Amino acid sequence: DIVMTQSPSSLAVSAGEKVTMNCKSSQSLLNSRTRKNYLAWYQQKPGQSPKLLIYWASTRESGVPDRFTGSGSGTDFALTISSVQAEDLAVYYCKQSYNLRTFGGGTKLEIKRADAAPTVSIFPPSSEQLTSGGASVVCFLNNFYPKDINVKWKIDGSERANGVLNSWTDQDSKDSTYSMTSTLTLTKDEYERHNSYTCEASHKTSTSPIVKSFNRNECX
Amino acid sequence: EVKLVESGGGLVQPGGSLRLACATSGFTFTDYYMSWVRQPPGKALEWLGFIRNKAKGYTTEYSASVKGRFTISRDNSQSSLYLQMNTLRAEDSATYYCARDHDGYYERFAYWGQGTLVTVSAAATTPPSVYPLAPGNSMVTLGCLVKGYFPEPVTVTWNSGSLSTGVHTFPAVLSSDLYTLTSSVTVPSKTWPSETVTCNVAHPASSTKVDKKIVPR
Ligand SMILES: C=CCO[C@]1(C(=O)O)C[C@@H](O[C@]2(C(=O)O)C[C@@H](O)[C@@H](O)[C@@H]([C@H](O)CO)O2)[C@@H](O)[C@@H]([C@H](O)CO)O1
Ligand SMILES: [Zn+2]
Numbered sequence: 001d002i003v004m005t006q007s008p009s010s011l012a013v014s015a016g017e018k019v020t021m022n023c024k025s026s027q028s029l030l031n032s033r034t035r036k037n038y039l040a041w042y043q044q045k046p047g048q049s050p051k052l053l054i055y056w057a058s059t060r061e062s063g064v065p066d067r068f069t070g071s072g073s074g075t076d077f078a079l080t081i082s083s084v085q086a087e088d089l090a091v092y093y094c095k096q097s098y099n100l101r102t103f104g105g106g107t108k109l110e111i112k113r114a115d116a117a118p119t120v121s122i123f124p125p126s127s128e129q130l131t132s133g134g135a136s137v138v139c140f141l142n143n144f145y146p147k148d149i150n151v152k153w154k155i156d157g158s159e160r161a162n163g164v165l166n167s168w169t170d171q172d173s174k175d176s177t178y179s180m181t182s183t184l185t186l187t188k189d190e191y192e193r194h195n196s197y198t199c200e201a202s203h204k205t206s207t208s209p210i211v212k213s214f215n216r217n218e219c220x
Numbered sequence: 221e222v223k224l225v226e227s228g229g230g231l232v233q234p235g236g237s238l239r240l241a242c243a244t245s246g247f248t249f250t251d252y253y254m255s256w257v258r259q260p261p262g263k264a265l266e267w268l269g270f271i272r273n274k275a276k277g278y279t280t281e282y283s284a285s286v287k288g289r290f291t292i293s294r295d296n297s298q299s300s301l302y303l304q305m306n307t308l309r310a311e312d313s314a315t316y317y318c319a320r321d322h323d324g325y326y327e328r329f330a331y332w333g334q335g336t337l338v339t340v341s342a343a344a345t346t347p348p349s350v351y352p353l354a355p356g357n358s359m360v361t362l363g364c365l366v367k368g369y370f371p372e373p374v375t376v377t378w379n380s381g382s383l384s385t386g387v388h389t390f391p392a393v394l395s396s397d398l399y400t401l402t403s404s405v406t407v408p409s410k411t412w413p414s415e416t417v418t419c420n421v422a423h424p425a426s427s428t429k430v431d432k433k434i435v436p437r
């Protein structure tokens with residue numbers, strides 16, 4: 001029955017800048033007997049397990065960089081990063097252990113960087129897949145910023161929206177870029193009725209779309 | 221060194237039961253409380269329960285969300301921890317972590333396992349199809365398409381993990397009860413095709429192991 005709330009839900013900060021994230025408890029976590037606040041902070045990088053950063057509100061775990069600082073008392077706590085680095089991309093969770101344990105809802109920290117255009121690659125269906133009666137055309141849009149991007153597929157010069165699934169990666173921990181995959185799936189029968197397959201990427205970094213194409217007659 | 225490893229995750233029908241295990245080493249097990257924590261894909265961590273240490277009689281406590289339905293136990297002869305889950309439902313679909321808890325002094329979860337993914341669904345296990353993504357000029361990008369599988373997860377490495385940087389593996393997307401993901405890798409044009417590039421795909425639920433060599437068309 002202790003409610004933990006964190007804010008903001010998310011934010012983005014440029015490398016080198018300061019960041020503050022807040023954690024609120026519905027009741028004091030100050031254990032009057034041990035004179036300590038039972039509040040810990042955890043860091044969860046994309047695809048990883050949570051890692052302990054701070055405990056007792058302000059004690060920094062060994063091996064944790066000095067730029068991370070925990071502060072506060074009672075019902076209000078904060079985690080401050082004095083100088084954000086690209087690798088600091090993560091969700092940060094606070095957790096009370098005053099009465100059983102309870103995690104806050106987390107704060108997602110993303111990194112702001114200079115705009116970067118995507119590197120676009122297109123790939124025709126494999127013969128194994130075609131032989132099985134299916135046809136997937138895949139376009140990778142790699143290492144761009146910001147995350148917002150548009151892809152349109154063109155078959156023989158005409159747009160097609162049906163059968164397309166998109167997937168963005170989380171931000172990259174080293175260069176702070178995003179990447180995305182777009183996959184257009186067709187039947188073999190339909191695939192074999194057209195020649196040109198085009199993947200068009202529109203990103204704020206250019207007024208001209210990045211275009212990658214292949215022609216079936218040229219052997220995919 | 222401290223080691224925590226969860227196992228037992230996978231697909232289970234709505235209404236069914238499943239038991240997870242957590243094997244530990246590198247510390248005096250009986251000295252430590254142990255906790256279970258879970259996390260639905262893309263959502264927040266949730267503490268589920270703990271089992272106290274020797275000094276405290278190995279007693280258990282649970283969050284209100286699972287009390288009466290989940291059971292924690294430990295085997296001190298083998299330094300392992302268990303979570304028995306009953307009457308599973310969709311909300312129970314999550315990655316489950318064990319974590320080393322209180323030792324009578326410190327208030328911290330100092331160590332966590334890699335976690336094990338539990339999927340509660342009536343849909344059937346389906347192994348992936350794996351297709352090579354070859355091009356057609358300084359750097360060259362290659363890929364593998366892992367299509368039509370269930371449940372999560374799958375793992376993709378390149379050259380048995382010796383190709384690490386320049387890799388992007390895209391989060392799976394569910395469509396019609398089947399997942400699809402892809403992975404790209406970007407290497408110098410000089411290294412391929414002169415040197416071999418191979419994606420290694422594993423799908424634990426179906427015990428699938430796949431190597432697909434990327435060959436020029
Ligand atoms: C008067 C307090 C006594 O607390 C202890 C003690 O022996 O000092 C420890 C308590 O630990 C827990 C618990 O519920 O087991 C877990 C700790 O991580 C922490 O949450 C504390 C909480 O700060 C209250 O003290 O509780 C507990 O074992 C307690 C008694 O055995 C049961 O109340 O004894
Ligand atoms: Zn009790």
Ligand SMILES: [Zn+2]
Pocket residue numbers: 142143172386387388
């Ligand atoms: Zn990259």
